[PDB]
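Thread: Modeling a multi-component assembly for a lab meeting

Hi all, long-time lurker, first post. My supervisor asked me to bring a structural picture of a complex we are working on to next week's group meeting, and I have zero experience with this. I have the sequence lines for every component (813 residues in total). Could someone generate the structure of the whole assembly? Inputs are pasted exactly as I received them:
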Amino acid sequence: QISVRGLAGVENVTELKKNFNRHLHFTLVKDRNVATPRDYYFALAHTVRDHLVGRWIRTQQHYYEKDPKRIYYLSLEFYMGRTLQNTMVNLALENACDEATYQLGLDMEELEEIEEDAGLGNGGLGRLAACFLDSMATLGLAAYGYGIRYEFGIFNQKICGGWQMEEADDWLRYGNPWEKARPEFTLPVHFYGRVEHTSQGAKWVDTQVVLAMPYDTPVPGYRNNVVNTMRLWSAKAPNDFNLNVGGYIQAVLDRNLAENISRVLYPNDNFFEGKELRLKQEYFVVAATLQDIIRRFKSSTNFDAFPDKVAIQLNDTHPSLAIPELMRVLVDLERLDWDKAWEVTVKTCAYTNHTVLPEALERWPVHLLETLLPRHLQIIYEINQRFLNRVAAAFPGDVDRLRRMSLVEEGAVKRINMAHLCIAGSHAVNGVARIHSEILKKTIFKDFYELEPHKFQNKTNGITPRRWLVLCNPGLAEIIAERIGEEYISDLDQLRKLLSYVDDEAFIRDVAKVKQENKLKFAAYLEREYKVHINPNSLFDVQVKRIHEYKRQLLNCLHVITLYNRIKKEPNKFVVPRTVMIGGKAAPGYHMAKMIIKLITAIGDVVNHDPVVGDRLRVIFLENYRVSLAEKVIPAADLSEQISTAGTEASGTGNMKFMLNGALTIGTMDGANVEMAEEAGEENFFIFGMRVEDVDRLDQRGYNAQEYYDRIPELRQIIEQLSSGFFSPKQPDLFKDIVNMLMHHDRFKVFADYEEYVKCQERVSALYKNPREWTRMVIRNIATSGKFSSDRTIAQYAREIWGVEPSRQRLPA
Ligand SMILES: O=C(Nc1ccccc1)C(=O)N[C@@H]1O[C@H](CO)[C@@H](O)[C@H](O)[C@H]1O
Ligand SMILES: O=C(Nc1ccccc1)C(=O)N[C@@H]1O[C@H](CO)[C@@H](O)[C@H](O)[C@H]1O
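Re: Modeling a multi-component assembly
Sure thing. I ran the full set together rather than chain by chain. Output:
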């Protein structure tokens, strides 16, 4: 149908059809008379997966022959989403499969909807890892993603009576056609035990063993025949585990305890919970991964070359135990001297920070590490002692610096600061957007920057244009390709060529047509699967991201209520119709976040049923926001809400997805919004509110929310409506906690940005009244979105941290 989706050759289509029928028969053990839609999905997945095998085997043998430096990306989260369409896109198989299935009497899009998301992440950090894997393969890097194969991913969100309910994400129930179990590469991981000091070195003894079984998933590069590996570990009890009939049976049942390690993803976004099971998960991935790395390195004794052949990237502090684990193996097992082992470790490891919120930073109680990982604790103490001796030599007499920089935090319970460990043990430390990286050097890691300035870098985040343009918005990808060709898909900077089309009447019409079609398609999705009715001609105002106070969904809520109150005051006055869509999951134990969701639905309940409002304002909570839903709503959006308090959103990546897909942005100068505005021009961005400096000034003075309440009559009305039970008639005090927080303990200064936000939103509505000028500004955004390709980001990691050169060169098919 459309060019960017590839060729549908006679030979290919015939071969796809016959292999589809072969799998339906031999693999699924079905015929066409009994086959269900799910059977058809699986037959297709197997048909496509067959095309990966040859390339996968030859990519890995190529790495064996050439022996390039290997990149190991360690993460507790990989938010992959669906794999079928992505695989077809990267293999140029989409049109061929579409044709083949069409001739078999099947709709491929319908089959694609059957696949479960691989929801092995919470949000931004997990999705970044996924985009990164795609870019690393597309850039021909010898890269491996290493993580955990959770049996249960991020929970499925159900909304019941306006409240979030959680249910287990049983994503493996029907099987996963995209993984290959590798039970022959199973490795032991050790826990507990004790440290024994012998004549020659320390020994870690009397441990309990859990097995780590790897599952490999292919990661195809974009049309370069490269297929890299994501290896995810699953926990397995050894056969003699816990080994009378009651006794025998119980011993077998108790194997569950060991296997619980990989059972479920911790559902916290930007928060630290010091649970033993989480620590076990963190060590489990680290221990199994490092053994795999060392084994592969030896199959190339001399560890001087280790950093020349290995890079380990730590996705935040979650796999920070890689540092003392590498030291443990090098010192205790390989018998290297401390100083050499340390040199190797530092040159191998690099650390990426993803948040400055203090509650999110990992600080593990010493007593936990003492029991679970006694040898690692000893190594951490030794690292700390040697590190502090260095600090003391550089800043003599600065006793407070010593305590501030210590890996060991004193207090009620002694804790290890994992971020401090990571900085000490890495040759590179980076933030994820220019403003964030500057904040790291100026505030939370200031002491470390002063000691080792060369270590600190920036690597602004990005998104893959494959999933986030070609896959989810083929219509836009096509109208761009018609003008500037196809090369932009792996060279997004080429989108700048679209600037010469900003006055092109045909292109303006095409951009606007593509958006309208996307909005119609999404409006049809909402009716079919949720029976909700929306005006497709209205401005699609969307805020999708995890529910957190710093992201300020509440500020959005305040604007929504302002609009409703204004309509009610002057009903027969024209307003630009809006569909306000808010979606995202709340962490199960985050009360305030759960209250915010209830508020959103409560506002919708009132607004959506007021006859005076009509089709002029609609408020919808998008249930179960996840990668597959993002691929649907983002292409349909007109306005992207990126309204975090300045200095709180490290980067954001949802922002980039919207920019690439033809939405305009209303946002604070926070995270990557700053660079987005810089790329597009501030005239082409709806910027409002406090900058970081303004927040700092307010903090010095003290933030008094009452001041705003007293001086803004429209804000007073909203608070009074909330408190009185206007939005909860049967439970008048339902939102008392929200009001109290806003008035008395608001860390994120919702009121301080209220006036500027509402004013800015009026300017959005004004522009939307002029479709031609709206679209022209959209073109200016898409055209300057190139910087935010994860290909750019990965190329920078490669050259500036890993010391490897990216390549767009094809491997033979
Ligand atoms: O090939 C497989 N997965 C794969 C292949 C290519 C790309 C992505 C995933 C796979 O899972 N094969 C399974 O191996 C089992 C033995 O190890 C067989 O019993 C299964 O029938 C087969 O599906
Ligand atoms: O810190 C994060 N997650 C987390 C933190 C602790 C425990 C589990 C997950 C996180 O997701 N941070 C986000 O990283 C994104 C990718 O760099 C950024 O775009 C976001 O700004 C940041 O909040």
